[PDB]
Design a protein around this ligand. Structure first.
Ligand SMILES: [Mg+2]
Ligand SMILES: [Mg+2]
Ligand SMILES: [Mg+2]
Ligand SMILES: [Mg+2]
Ligand SMILES: [Mg+2]
Ligand SMILES: [Mg+2]
Ligand SMILES: [Mg+2]
Ligand SMILES: [Mg+2]
Ligand SMILES: [Mg+2]
Ligand SMILES: [Mg+2]
Ligand SMILES: [Mg+2]
Ligand SMILES: [Mg+2]
Ligand SMILES: [Mg+2]
Ligand SMILES: [Mg+2]
Ligand SMILES: [Mg+2]
Ligand SMILES: [Mg+2]
Ligand SMILES: [Mg+2]
Ligand SMILES: [Mg+2]
Ligand SMILES: [Mg+2]
Ligand SMILES: [Mg+2]
Ligand SMILES: [Mg+2]
Ligand SMILES: [Zn+2]
Ligand SMILES: [Zn+2]
Ligand SMILES: [Zn+2]
Lengths: 114, 412, 412, 412, 114, 114, 114, 114, 114
């Protein structure tokens, strides 16, 4: 039988340094080559709210559905997520600072096919 | 579900999990459904050790006269303070005497002492040790406890049961106190810290039945005829083994009676010295959880009774993770007897009536008279119904309250 | 993280896990953050059953005279011993009398008896059952308890409240004791095991308020004027339902007062007989955790009060996993009253002052006089402020200690 | 293993799991191995608040005469009832007097009062507050407690220690009682709810040693000579830090002695006001688990001692999740002293003998004479061996029972 | 040996903003390119009941078998599901609002082959 | 290197509405295209016993080995299973009603190669 | 990019009905097409000991290394295993009855390449 | 249908012996053939802080965003991670010694496609 | 779309019978066809220490970095590991007996591509 070596699909990340008190990292699957993402890690330099949004617009965020998924307190990593978003389903992930001061946010995961 | 918890390593947010075994360093639980504890938070080993007041500290041996045997300061192997007393004898008893500067009143006072056995040999590797009060007329009141291997291998407190009294002894006019042993070829025992506790309350009786024999059913009826509480020192493996043992349903039916309760005796009766501490720990743990499945709950299942009466500080240390109190075995009236206040919940004995009721009945009468707690025990295969009735009628007619082990420990 | 634990099946080493529900056979936790227990380790059902001494035994019915009704041995349906007593009557009361061989002194003694209702019918399906002591001059002192359906369906102990006394009764010179009922068309009740307990301590009062009505705020002020502890028998669903109920903030503010405490009354007040045991169990569990979220902690939240006073041994068995003690309802002075030492933490009643303060005030005066504990209760919508003041002034002026349920259970 | 549990979200059936941290809403555990509790089920804050009976009510201030200072009703900031009393003074003490309608007997009665400090200023931001009893001959007996910032910031009960007595004072013939302070430039303090408790039992002594200095070894020998229990208020970070502190092995060796026990003092001695409540909570939690790893167990590790004696209701609220009882600091005899029954396990002080033994020895003699509990303390680096011996001999010669904190809390 | 990079299969989502009190998001695997779905995430803006239904009809929902899978309370994310549905087996997932007010529902997952 | 999008293998389900009190859904891997199945989900409209059976016959169930795997109480979903069966190894999964009344059973999973 | 549907690799099972008190099911990876196996499930009709053995012989079991992996009590399923064996490394899994009576044993899993 | 044997994608490791007290192992995804990594294991010979960094520079670490992910105490293995980094997103993982003495650090995982 | 059956990548095992008291099984990824391994199972006939080592030498073990991963007590299986080693990164896994007597050690897992 044929042997093939499987290397895992395209790495995805979004990051922002010095996100101000109530500002946010908008993770947009439009930035993915495949147009969909699965975020595995959220490294949070301080407290954040994670929010999943559907847009009315194909290309810009105009809030339709919005659900606040979870709140993270202090500094650390939310490892082992599968929060998913795509361009065609107009889904965005917003990570909003709640720390009372400037923080670094790094979100990593994988690109998924639409 | 939420998102995964903060951290590196394998993290997971779950809804519902099932596990056989969970190990956690930290567990934060918002609502706990865990009535069946194996490990108890309470360490009882040293809670009662300092109850009452120190009478004799042995920090100055000048006040003590060696009447027979010999007395010296022990300054390295010390229980309490700067020193303890070494009691040494060759081919003789030891008897050491302290004369009080003024007449003492010991009405309703119970006696306790710290003890370590280094060496006893001759007729026995053990001795009765006696605290003995002498009045102005040279009448004695004797209280006693046992200096045995195992339980005496390390420093531990004995709570002394009444043994005997000379007629006309005046407990308001005590002139001298005596610590004495039986005669042996070699004696080397350390003592410290004689303590006095208030034991002026009514006399008390605890009855336990060991090893879950079929005769426990007739016992439950007989002691039931006077509302005397029975503790079953239960080995859960023994249930349904043979016609000579209770069935599981019979045991549950006995525990459903208002006066019968169960205490742990290890799943398969593993005694100290016959098995490793690890095997006994497993026996203790399994005994606890199997009895908890049979419906024996917290205050009851916090008591253990030593298999075959065998113990040492090693086993006490292990048992203290699982149980608050344990009891050994003896065959004489004073073995049943403690003051109503303990100083050790681990070193006290129970008196057998397997080999005749006389010593146990004597203990019950003495508990009534001298305001002490008598713990008496039997195996129901060794005791006839008329013997159980003799003991039960003795308990009914005496001025004692019959009590549970739970009650007795909650009094401390 | 470490490597995966020993074993087959799904094994996993984690750093941090979150779950809604965890099931484990065994959990080893190095540091436990679980103050909020639902399932309590303590089984209180049979702890207190053997306290005090058996006075009347019923193992020989020769000492008893049936004055009215009839008395027979029950050897098949036995609480304690070889037998119990069947009290039977047609269109009459039962009155059975035991004459003592010598004058008894019952100063500061409280009375308790084992009871099962087989059948009562006529004017009611229930009866007062009375223990009377009669002196040399034929004066009676009456203590009583209730033989009711549900709570009487299985063997259970009643702790008898003082009811009445003939003027000049000498409790040091008791010559006879009587067990008696009211007259009914049919009576069939089993009795066993009359017990005497020491109740020589000061009289005590417990006040509970049921069902979290808005009037609990005025109650807290009124009973506050004399530092009398109030137990709120709380249903957490009722909070914020309507203007007639406390808000969540008002309830939390009341519990922040040093004399107001909460006990469980079920989330949504599910009573026995109206709902299944499973639904009541859910109500009990939810009541417990919702009150724990409101800050009600261990000794307090170990108490339950029966919704509508309804119970049976079925509900007691279920409740014993969650609570140590529970209280039913009655309308007469003796319903409030128990000896200071209980023998059942499950079968005892409380006296209502919803329908006039007279019986409750009588109970408080009797608790003071006869050294008993009175448990009195109300719904604050049924009672005026001037009635609460009458009761609170009665408690202040009487020789009673007003106490919490926590204090009362810790005394047992 | 079985199949996965019921539910949506990530469900999982496991054999064996290991975790660093587990969070669960519901945990059902069939057999629990979790002896090391951090978070305790018991909330002690308000259990004891309603002990004894209300003597002085403050619901009618007509019975009170302001001898010096001024007295007014507080109807908005009320501890208990409809009102509390505001005691106010400018450049003077406050002294308010209640004359009894008939002579009171206060033999063996202990006094407690609810207190809130609004403002004290002048020589100090704090005052002794004194309950005086005055007899027919105008002899005073004074009991006192401290109105301090932090501990006085919110309503809390003080249990008043004996301070002084005029020769020939007749406690059977009390005609008047006084509440009084020292003189200050400004006084504004609220009082409510004077309570009387029974304290007729024997006098008691508790000895604690703070901050785990090397001198605790000599202390253990000295107090050992008379079997007096020592509580080590232990900070686990301090172990092995320097030659001036105990080693870990030395500490474990001390705790292995029958009369030495440990109580929590926070991992790194974080005091109130110097750190946030969150940092202190972490210190408390870590202190608890580190001492648990060293073998300190349930009843012992349920006690805390405030670092530097600093506290407020904020800290008490946090500590009440972890501990049942805590102790502050004072330098005078009455600071040691409480009635044998507390009404607050959180607001009571200990007397230092770091700066001379006189006040502590006075407290021990007063505990014996007036049937109270004295809590005395030291740092072993501040106290010489001859001073420890002076105190230990004082305790031995006095009519006091030396007790553990565990014993004392179990009495409440 | 041959090396291949594996990108993960087609992203699927269903969403609805402002679902009224007792209304529902019907997740229909007919909307998938492959005609089967596996829902991993349910982001619930308030309380919902999740229900798995078989239809008698190949194309429309006419309830045959229906099982209420689980109830979610308040706002959050049910991560880590594998609730599965296909067109050919006529399986539908209904997420029904139970909040007492209007909510946003976002369900995400993956398309699976029939 | 070559990039390929991996869509997950064939969806499998078995379902029955109104299964009577002691009747059962027999999940037969003969109904799979690949002749083997892995059941991930059991949605149970009431109490059920799950049972794994080997047949003596290649095509019909004649019980050889039978093991009762687990009992489910009330209504819900057993998510995250891997109970496996194949035609060639003559393995069947039986889900038996135990509710005391009629229930809906839906089992979903994936086809596996033999 | 290319889309491929991934069906999971070859199902493996071993089973025995009425295994006597101290007898055993010998799971032999020689019975696998690929010559290696990964057992995921052990359905045990009563108590069993599971044991992993290396043979000295390429084709028959002559015990070299033997480790008793775990003991299962009563009836149920050990789901979620990865006990692995191959022909070339001469590894066998023995499931031994310990029930005191006859039991049914079914082990399922997947074939793995050597 | 075609059968293929899937061997898992390229192993990645970074290691350092005798890392001094406050020194660090810089795990750089530039060292991966595929230019992205997913670290699964951190074997820590003593206490370490793990830190995720974004660089301003395409090729060197000049700290932009930095988040301290977690602290490990004593010796052991952090198994089951998915901390991810890529060259193109300029992400670095720093494992910093905190032991008070020299330690060995070994990090292992897998290369991922960008 | 194309359907392919995925069989899982090459089985790997190392074993030793009668390993003396302080001796060890050296698991060497040089023995793998692909030159890297991921150990999933350690079946331990008695107590063992597991240790991860980097060599200075490309072909022989000369200890550079060494971390003791974990200690196993008594007999059993450490299932569900991912301890990883490769030849090119000179990583070795040593399982050292600590039992006080001779034991059997069997380690199983999968070959991974370098
Ligand atoms: Mg779009
Ligand atoms: Mg919205
Ligand atoms: Mg489109
Ligand atoms: Mg000494
Ligand atoms: Mg009877
Ligand atoms: Mg007031
Ligand atoms: Mg269709
Ligand atoms: Mg239906
Ligand atoms: Mg079709
Ligand atoms: Mg077939
Ligand atoms: Mg069969
Ligand atoms: Mg075939
Ligand atoms: Mg071979
Ligand atoms: Mg071998
Ligand atoms: Mg070969
Ligand atoms: Mg770059
Ligand atoms: Mg920064
Ligand atoms: Mg670039
Ligand atoms: Mg190499
Ligand atoms: Mg090294
Ligand atoms: Mg090379
Ligand atoms: Zn025995
Ligand atoms: Zn009610
Ligand atoms: Zn300090």
């Amino acid at each position: 039988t044929d042997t093939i070596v499987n290397v895992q699909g395209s790495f995805f990340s979004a990051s922002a340094s010095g996100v101000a008190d109530t500002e946010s990292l908008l993770i947009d699957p439009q930035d993915a080559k495949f147009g969909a993402i699965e975020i595995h890690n959220i490294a949070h330099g301080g407290s954040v709210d994670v929010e999943l949004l559907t847009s009315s617009d194909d290309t810009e965020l105009v809030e339709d559905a919005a659900v606040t998924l979870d709140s993270f307190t202090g500094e650390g990593i939310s490892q082992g997520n599968q929060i998913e978003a795509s361009d065609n389903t107009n889904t965005y992930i917003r990570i909003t600072n709640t720390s009372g001061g400037a923080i670094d946010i790094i979100a990593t995961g994988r690109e998924v096919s639409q | 579900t939420g998102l995964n918890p903060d951290g590196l390593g394998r993290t997971a947010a779950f809804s519902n999990t099932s596990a056989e075994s969970v190990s956690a360093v930290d567990a934060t639980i918002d609502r706990l459904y865990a009535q069946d504890r194996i490990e108890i938070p309470t360490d009882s080993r040293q809670l009662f050790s300092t109850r009452g007041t120190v009478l004799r500290n042995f920090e100055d041996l000048s006040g003590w006269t060696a009447n027979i045997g010999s007395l010296s300061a022990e300054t390295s192997d010390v229980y309490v303070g700067s020193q303890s007393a070494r009691l040494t004898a060759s081919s003789s008893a030891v008897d050491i005497r302290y004369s009080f500067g003024t007449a003492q009143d010991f009405t309703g006072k119970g006696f306790s002492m710290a003890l370590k056995r280094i060496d006893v040999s001759g007729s026995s590797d053990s001795t009765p040790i006696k605290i003995r009060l002498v009045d102005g007329n040279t009448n004695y009141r004797t209280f006693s406890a046992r200096c045995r291997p195992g339980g005496g291998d390390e420093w531990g407190r004995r709570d002394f049961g009444f043994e005997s009294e000379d007629t006309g002894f005046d407990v308001t006019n005590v002139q001298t106190m005596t610590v004495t042993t039986n005669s042996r070829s070699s004696i080397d025992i350390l003592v410290d810290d004689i303590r006095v506790v208030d034991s002026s309350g009514t006399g008390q009786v605890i009855v336990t039945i060991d090893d879950v024999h079929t005769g426990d059913k007739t016992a439950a009826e007989v002691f039931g005829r006077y509302g005397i509480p029975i503790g079953l020192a239960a080995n859960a493996k023994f249930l349904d083994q043979s016609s000579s043992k209770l069935t599981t349903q019979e045991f549950k039916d006995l525990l459903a009676k208002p006066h019968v309760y169960a205490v742990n005796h290890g799943y398969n009766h593993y005694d100290y010295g016959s098995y490793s501490i690890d095997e006994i720990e497993d026996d203790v743990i399994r005994g606890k959880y199997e009895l908890q499945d049979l419906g024996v709950r917290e205050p009851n299942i916090n008591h253990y009774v030593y298999p075959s009466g065998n113990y040492a500080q090693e086993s006490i240390d292990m048992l203290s993770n699982y149980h608050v109190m344990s009891w050994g075995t003896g065959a004489e009236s004073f073995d049943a007897l403690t003051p109503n206040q303990l100083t050790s919940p681990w070193h006290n004995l129970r008196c057998s009536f397997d080999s005749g009721t006389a010593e146990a009945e004597q203990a019950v009468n003495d508990a009534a008279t001298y305001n002490q707690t008598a713990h008496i025990y039997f195996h129901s295969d060794n005791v006839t119904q008329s013997e159980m009735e003799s003991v039960a009628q003795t308990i009914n007619s005496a001025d004692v309250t019959p009590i549970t082990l739970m009650d007795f420990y909650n009094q401390q």
